[PDB]
């Protein structure tokens, strides 16, 4: 019950009913049962940080009409 928009480098948007309790990668594994996108080649950026796998939505303060970046990468850290 908290909805996020996942923006690409295009401008395009993605909206997610997500919960607070999710992990990065729960919301990635969103990712991949809508786009297709492999988790595993997704990176995810909020506030200038790259968010990571294990930290809750809730971590990162991500709030309701919160917008997180997608860009495609395979290695991170």
Do not use: C, H
Not at 14 to 34: A, F, H, M, Y
Not at 41 to 46: D, G, P, Q, S, V
Not at 49 to 54: I, L, R, S, T, V
């Amino acid at each position: 019950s908290m909805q996020v928009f996942i923006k690409n480098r295009y401008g395009w948007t993605i909206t997610l009913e997500v919960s607070p309790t999710d992990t990065v990668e729960n919301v990635k594994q969103k990712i991949q049962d809508k786009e297709g996108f492999p988790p595993d080649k997704i990176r995810l950026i909020y506030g200038g940080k790259q968010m990571e796998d294990g930290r809750t939505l809730a971590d990162y303060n991500v709030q309701k009409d919160s917008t997180i970046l997608i860009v495609i990468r395979d290695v991170d850290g």
